[PDB]
Amino acid sequence: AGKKVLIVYAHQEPKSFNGSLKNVAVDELSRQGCTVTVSDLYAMNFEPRATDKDITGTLSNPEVFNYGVETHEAYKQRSLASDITDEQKKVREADLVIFQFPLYWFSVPAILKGWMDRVLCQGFAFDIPGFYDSGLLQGKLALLSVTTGGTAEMYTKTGVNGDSRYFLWPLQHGTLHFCGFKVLAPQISFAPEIASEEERKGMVAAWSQRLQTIWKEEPIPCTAHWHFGQ
């Protein structure tokens, strides 16, 4: 039996360092025999805004619009917009979701935030109850592959930015773990715009090399202690 991978990719420029890391992931996972799909959010002009257009059916309560409630129900009625349900198919079938993005404001670019907000709806990714370790995507793996402007030392506890692990918490725990994913350790490629040609090559090579044995890695313990120390 093989493995299915979805790469959710958020960068405007094919020739960027992010583009290189995404292409390398496709090549290496494809070479392994994996089933691979890429959602290139900017080329898709993916809609990030959570709005009433996300539901192609009778809006249940059209007097007071509640996005959570309307999308939950629309999920059950199979009446979500097709951009959403197309992504949900991709996610439903994946054994591994990789997110490839440059860090914007200690988080994901908005187009990618919008993918999280609209795709990962109640009924689909979680239920109440049915989250964290009972999240509806248990059994899947997830991996953040992030590039920064800041260097590694800036992202240490004694540095100006604090530990890079600090900003991971809403993504790794708040989102991914919440939906039931097991989380592989993040790939962080620090400061590529500042690095030499060779350092950049080494970072891209370190990532393809990691992907070779990706199916053998254990998930991190996705806890407050992993992220915060103490």
Ligand X SMILES: Cc1cc2nc3c(=O)[nH]c(=O)nc-3n(C[C@H](O)[C@H](O)[C@H](O)COP(=O)(O)OP(=O)(O)OC[C@H]3O[C@@H](n4cnc5c(N)ncnc54)[C@H](O)[C@@H]3O)c2cc1C
Does 150 bind ligand CB1 (CB under 6 A)? Our answer is yes
In the complex, the smallest distance separating the C-beta of residue 162 from Zn ion, rounded to whole angstroms, is: 8
Residue 206 CA to residue 125 CA, distance in Å, equals 32
**Which among 31-39, 58-66, 82-90, 143-151 is the span making contact with ligand CB1, rule CB under 6 A?**
143-151
158 in helix, strand or coil?
A: coil
68, 139, 202, 229: which one binds ligand CB1 (CB under 6 A): 68
Q: Does residue 168 contact residue 186 with C-beta atoms inside 8 Å?
A: yes
Would the annotation count 161 as a binding residue? no
Q: Is the dihedral of CA 38, 115, 165, 160 positive or negative?
A: positive
162, 186, 204, 208: which one binds a copy of itself (CB under 8 A): 162
227 touches which of ligand X, a copy of itself, Zn ion, none (CB within 5 to 8 A by kind)?
a copy of itself
CB proximity list for 100: less than 8 A, separation 6 or greater: 7, 8, 9, 10, 11, 18, 21, 22, 25, 145
What value, to the nearest 5°, has the Cα angle with vertex 55 and ends 72 and 180?
35
117, 185, 208, 210: which one binds a copy of itself (CB under 8 A): 117
What value, to the nearest 5°, has the Cα angle with vertex 116 and ends 119 and 52?
55
92, 173, 200, 210: which one binds Zn ion (CB under 5 A): 173
In the complex, the smallest distance separating the C-beta of residue 120 from a copy of itself, rounded to whole angstroms, is: 8
Residue 184 CA to residue 166 CA, distance in Å, equals 16
**Which among 11-19, 26-34, 73-81, 130-138 is the span making contact with ligand X, rule CB under 6 A?**
11-19
Footprint on this chain of ligand X (rule: CB under 6 A): 11, 15-18, 20, 50, 64, 66-68, 102-106, 117, 147-150, 174, 192-193, 197, 200-201, 204
Binding residues for substrate: 126-128
